[PDB]
Write a protein that binds this DNA or RNA. Structure first.
Lengths: 92, 57, 247
RNA sequence: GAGUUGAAAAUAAGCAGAGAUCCGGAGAUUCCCGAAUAGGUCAACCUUUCGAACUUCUGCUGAAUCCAUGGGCAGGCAAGAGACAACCUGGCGAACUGAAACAUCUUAGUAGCCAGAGGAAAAGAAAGCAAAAGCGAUUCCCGUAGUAGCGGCGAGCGAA
RNA sequence: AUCCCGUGUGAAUCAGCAAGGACCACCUUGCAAGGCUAAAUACUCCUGGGUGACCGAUAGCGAAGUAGUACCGUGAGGGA
RNA sequence: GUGAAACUAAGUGGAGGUCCGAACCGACUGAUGUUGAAGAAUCAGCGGAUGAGUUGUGGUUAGGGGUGAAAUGCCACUCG
RNA sequence: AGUAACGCAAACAUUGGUGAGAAUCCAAUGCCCCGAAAACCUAAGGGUUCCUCCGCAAGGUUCGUCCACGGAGGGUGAGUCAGGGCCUAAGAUCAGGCCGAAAGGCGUAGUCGAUGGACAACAGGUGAAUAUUCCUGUACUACCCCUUGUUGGUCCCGAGGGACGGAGGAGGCUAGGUUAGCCGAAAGAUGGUUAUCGGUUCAAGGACGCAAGGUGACCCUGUUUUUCAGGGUAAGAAGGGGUAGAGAAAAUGCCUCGAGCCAAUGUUCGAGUACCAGGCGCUACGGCGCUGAAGUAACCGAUGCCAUACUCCCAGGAAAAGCUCGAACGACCUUCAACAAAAGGGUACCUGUACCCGAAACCGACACAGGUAGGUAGGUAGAGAAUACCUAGGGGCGCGAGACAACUCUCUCUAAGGAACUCGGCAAAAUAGCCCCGUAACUUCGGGAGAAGGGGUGCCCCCUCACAAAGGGGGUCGAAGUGACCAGGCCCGGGCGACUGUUUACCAAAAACACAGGUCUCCGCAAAGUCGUAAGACCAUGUAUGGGGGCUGACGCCUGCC
C-alpha cells in the first residue's frame, strides 16, 4: 500500500490565494503564484492538488511557515503554462 | 568576570528536558504538581519548547 | 600494530567514582581517556604454542602487557613476565614443561617456583598476584589444596586444580620511577586528598580549632568514625583457608 | 408560534406560516495533545510497515522439559489504566506545643505523603454484654459523665 | 484480663472449647480460627428550589472587565 | 681516551608543572564610585598564560544531603 | 525642590529641505572616533523588534516632524546549508529478572539522546523586507524507466574499516599583501611636477596528470652520511595475488609478482555576446539607459591546505551506523522477478530561514560605563592578534548653551632639596627595545642571570659584503636618536612556606590548603572501605610494586626517654 505521511482532507488542503502586489510580481517575473495552505500539508499533497484541480504541470513547490500560524506556498508552474493566463481565469 | 546573574542563554531544549512536560509526567511527584496546577487554574502548567516550530503569534 | 580490534572499546567512563552519583571512592577524576585492554587471563586454548610479538603499555596496569599470536588464527594479550624475549613462544596446557611465560594447572608442577597469575577457584579469569612484580611461591601440596606464599608475606592453602602462569611478572622498575613532576599524580586521575586536622568538625572527627590541632580523640579515626590504626576490618568467619597471616 | 444567522452594533447574502431562530429527549461528528495507547517525543510534533501499545480473557501452534511454563501468531465494542473538592478505608507517620525545663506522656495516630473506592465508606448478625435479674447484629444522637479509672497518680487522658 | 501481630513451640470437638479484668473450682453466656449485606451516618468541586438582624467595590470568593489574569521566579510557587 | 668502560668538547633537537608578553582566565595595591554608569564595577598598573589550563554544548551527584587543593566555602544576588 | 542628576571627557559645525513648531529627523560638505572593532556573518536566547504608510495620548532621563513606541498591511521560498526521516558517547528510560510499606530502587536486551561519526551547490543577477532557498549558467547526490549478462537475491550473521593523543619545528604551496608591466583618466587656482589617481576579478565541479616536498629495503665507492653518479640482491614499499591448518572473507604461517607511491598545488573546460575604470542621455536629481580598454609577472607570506606527514614523549589517547568483503546455518519472493553497470531522460521528504546576535532587541528590573561560544584577520612602523594612525565598513556615544569662583575627581609641569611625609616609599616619579663587553655571594651544579654595572642607537656616503640580514671608517643636525605610543627598577639581610598552583562569588590570596616524598595501619578478592532497609553499585572489568585510611610535607642531617 502507498500511504501518505498523513491523511489530511485533500479538498481543503488549499485555502486562499494571496493578492498582494509582490504576488503579481511573482506571476509576471517567475511564472509562479501564491497560495495560503494549512500547516498540515506537503510538497507531495499540494503538488498533486494542482495538477488535478487546475490541469497544469507544476514545476516546484516552495513552502514556508508564517508566524501567525498559517502556511504560505509559492507554487511555480511549468514553462509551458503562463501563470498570468491561468490567474486571470481565477480572478487575480 | 561575570555577575551574580543566574539565568542565561541556555537552549530551551535543555530547559524542556528538565522542567518540561515529559519529566513532569515521568514521576508521581510531577503529576501531583500538575494536580496542583490544573486544580489552581493556570493557563500554562509547564514552560516548554517545541521540536518543530517556534510560536503561533 | 595499534587498533588491534582487541582493545575492546567501550568502557565505563574513565576512572569513575559514582555509585548513585555520590563520591564513594574518593579522589578520582582527570587524565586521559585510558582505553582498557581486554587481555586473556584464563587461557582457554591449551596445548597450542604461541609466540610473543609486542610489549604494549597498558595504561590500566602498573606493568606491561604483550600481544601473543598462535599457530591458529587468533590474537590475545597476556601479562608478560620478567624475561620475555621478543619472539619467544608460550603455551598453556596440563603437561607443558615449566618456562618463564607459559601456564599450567597447579598440580603438575614442583614446589618452590615463581608464579604470578594464579586462580583462587576454578572457572574464574585471574585473581591473585598480577601486579608489576607480584610473585607468588609454592610451599608443598596436599590432597586437594596447596599452601601458596603470595607476595604479601602471606600463605594460603588453595584449590589444587587452578591455572597458574609460571614466571616472575616484569616491569619491576616502577618501584623507583619517581613522580617528581608533582602534578603527575593528577595525570593518573587522582585528585588531591585533604587532611583530617584541617577540616571542620562537621566533616571529619578531627576538625580542630586554633592552630595545628592535635588529634584530640583517643584514637586517630576515619572520616566515618572508625579507629584507623590496628582495628582489623575483617569478618570473623568467612573461609578459614589462610594458614597464618604472617604479617 | 414570529422573526432569526452568540457577545455585538454595521455590511453582504440568506433562512422562515407545507412552522425558521429557540427549548427538551435520544443520536452523529469530535483534528492534535493529554491514561494517550503503532514507535519515538523536547505535550499540542516527527516517523510510519495506519497499528486499542501493555496487562487480563478466549483460540491455535506449542522451547530447555514428557506433561508444563515461557514465547509467537490471531480474535475481541475490549475487562483494567486516567481524572475526582470534601467525607471514608489501609499503610508510613512527625515536630513546634503543653508539662511553665525535659526524656515517660501530650500535641497525635492529628497534619502531611502514597494507594484504593462509593455516594456514601468502614463495621455488622454474637466463641457478645450482663449478673443470678435479664437483653438480643452493626452504625449514629442525648445521657450516665467529666463518673469508674489511667497517669514523672504530673501535664493531662477518659470509657463502659 | 479481652483484641491483633514478629520468632519459636504447639491442642480439644459438644462427656468439649472460649469469655465473664491474673488464676483455680462451680454456674451463666456464646460457638473463634469462612465470606456478603440496605437504613440511620459525615462532607461539598457541585445541581435544583427557599431563605438571610450576611457583604456592597480596602467588603464579599484571590477574582463584579484579560482573574489565578498582567507581573515576579529556572522551577516548586507567590500574586495584584 | 684505553683492549672495552668512566667522562668531555662541538653540532642536531625542542623538553619544561621554564621565562617576557597579547586574546583568555583571575582579582594584589591605590584612587574613584558609595540615593554608584554597576546590589561589586571603572581607571592606572598587576598574577598565570602548554597547563594541577580556559571555555562552549549535552549531562551527573539534592538538603538527617551534595560538593569542597578545606574557606563553614558553594548549591539560582538566600547557606552553621 | 524646581535641588541632585540627565548614564564616560569619540566632537561636532554650517548650509539647505520637511513642518504649525527643528541643536536633535533628512540631504550635502568638511571635522572627529573604532578599526583583532564601536566592522560583517552565524550558535544560543528573544519573538515580529524586520519593511512601507500613518500618528505623536504614554515611553525615549531634553526636544522631536524621528523611533526597537501606537495603528493598518506585508515579509522568513532549500534534494545540496543546519537538525529529523541514519548512527551511537556521557546520560536517561528500562520488556522480562532481582529487591522493596506504598511511591518506587538496582539492572540486561531494546529505544531515545549531539557537543561527535555518515551524507549532495557553487558563481553572477534580482530585490521596501528573502537568498548556497527565487532567475540564469554550469554541477553533484538518491531511486525509477530505457539497453548486456546472471539465476538467485534481501536481512540476520563472520571480518576489514570507520577510528581518533599532546608537543615540536622544517619543507612544498595556496589565501592575502606590496611592487612592476598594461589600460583609462587627470591640471586638483601654491615654487616645481605627473613622480598623480582608479582597475589589473573569477567559485563549486568535469577531465588530464606531480617535484627541486615526503615516502621506496641493505652494502661499498665521491661529497658534510646527505641532494645525485654507479653496481648487485629477487621482495625490499603503495599495492595486489596463490596456498596450509576445522579455515568463505579475515587473521596467522609460507611462496611469488610488482620501483614506484601520496597529496595539496597546477594546465584546460566551466569562463564571457559576465564583472569592471571611464565616457555617452534624462533627472521625482533617489538612479536607470547604451558602449566598453588591460585583466599579466615577480618578491614576501599565512595562525589555511598537504597533514591523523614525519620526529619525540608518557600521562598511552571514544562508540556505533554508513562503506567494503564473505561460506554454512535461519526468515521471505521468484521469472521478464532479482542483481551489477554503461550512456540518456524523469522525479526531489518535514522543520529552521526576517531581524538583534563584542547587543538599545540576549542576560544584568533600565535604550544599564558589565557579561556572552565560534568564523573572516587589510596598510604603514613594529617580533607580534600589543601599540600609534588609517582603507573597507560603521559611528559621533539621546540634554544643551553660557561662564572660567571655592572645592572634589581624571591628567601635565614644578625653582631649591630628596622620604625630612608616613603606620608603612602607600601612591606617583624613575628603569624600559635590539646588539657588544661584563657579571658576584651561594647552590640540589639545574640556576641566580636579562644578576649587578657600562657603552652604541637618528639620517646620509663608501667598501667588505654569508654577495637578504649585517660590520668598520667618515660626515651631518638637534639640548635630547628604541626622540611619540609601547617597553624589567635593582641590591644587601632575615622570618615563614621548598617550589607551579588552590582558597572565603560581594572587606581576609595568606604563614592557610594541596603537592612530590616519608612513615604507621587495614585489606587475599564472595577484598577492605563508602552509599543504600534490601537487591545491588563505586572500589574494579583493578588484585598487595595494588586499593582505602591517619599524620607529616621537596631536598640534607637526624627523629631521643616514658
Amino acid at each position: 500500500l502507498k500511504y501518505p505521511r498523513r491523511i489530511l482532507d485533500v479538498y481543503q488542503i488549499l485555502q486562499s490565494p494571496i493578492i498582494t502586489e509582490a504576488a503579481i510580481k511573482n506571476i509576471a517575473d517567475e511564472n509562479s503564484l501564491l497560495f495560503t495552505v494549512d500547516v498540515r500539508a506537503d510538497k507531495k499533497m499540494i503538488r498533486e492538488a494542482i495538477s488535478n484541480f487546475f490541469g497544469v504541470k507544476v514545476r516546484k513547490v516552495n513552502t514556508l511557515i508564517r508566524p501567525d500560524g498559517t502556511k504560505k506556498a509559492y507554487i511555480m508552474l511549468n514553462k509551458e503554462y503562463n501563470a498570468s493566463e491561468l490567474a486571470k481565469k481565477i480572478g487575480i | 568576570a561575570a555577575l551574580c546573574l543566574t539565568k542565561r542563554s541556555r537552549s530551551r531544549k535543555s530547559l524542556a528536558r528538565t522542567h518540561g512536560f515529559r519529566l513532569r509526567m515521568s514521576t508521581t511527584s510531577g503529576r501531583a504538581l500538575l494536580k496542583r496546577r490544573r486544580a489552581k487554574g493556570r493557563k500554562i502548567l509547564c514552560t516548554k519548547t517545541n521540536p518543530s516550530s517556534g510560536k503561533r503569534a | 600494530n595499534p587498533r588491534n580490534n582487541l582493545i575492546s572499546g567501550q568502557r565505563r567512563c574513565g576512572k569513575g567514582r559514582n555509585a548513585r552519583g555520590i563520591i564513594t571512592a574518593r579522589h578520582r577524576g582527570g587524565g586521559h581517556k585510558r582505553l582498557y585492554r581486554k587481555i586473556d587471563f584464563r587461557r582457554n586454548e591449551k596445548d597450542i604454542y604461541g609466540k610473543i610479538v609486542t610489549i604494549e603499555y597498558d595504561p590500566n596496569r602498573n606493568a606491561y602487557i604483550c600481544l601473543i599470536h598462535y599457530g591458529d588464527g587468533e590474537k590475545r594479550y597476556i601479562l608478560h613476565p620478567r624475561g620475555a624475549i621478543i619472539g619467544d613462544t608460550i603455551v598453556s596446557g596440563t603437561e607443558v614443561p615449566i618456562k618463564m611465560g607459559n601456564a599450567l594447572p597447579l598440580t603438575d608442577m614442583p614446589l618452590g617456583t615463581a608464579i604470578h597469575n594464579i586462580e583462587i577457584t576454578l572457572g574464574r579469569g585471574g585473581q591473585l598476584a598480577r601486579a608489576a612484580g607480584a610473585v607468588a611461591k609454592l610451599i608443598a601440596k596436599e590432597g586437594k589444596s596447596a599452601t601458596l606464599k603470595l607476595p604479601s608475606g602471606e600463605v594460603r592453602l588453595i584449590s589444587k586444580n587452578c591455572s597458574a602462569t609460571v614466571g616472575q611478572v616484569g616491569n619491576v622498575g616502577v618501584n623507583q620511577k619517581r613522580l617528581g613532576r608533582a602534578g603527575s599524580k593528577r595525570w593518573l586521575g587522582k585528585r588531591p586528598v585533604v587532611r583530617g586536622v584541617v577540616m571542620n568538625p562537621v566533616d571529619h572527627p578531627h576538625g580542630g580549632g586554633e592552630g595545628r590541632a592535635p588529634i584530640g580523640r583517643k584514637s586517630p579515626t576515619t572520616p566515618w568514625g572508625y579507629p584507623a590504626l590496628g582495628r582489623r576490618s575483617r569478618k570473623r568467619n568467612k573461609y578459614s583457608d589462610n594458614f597464618i597471616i604472617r604479617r
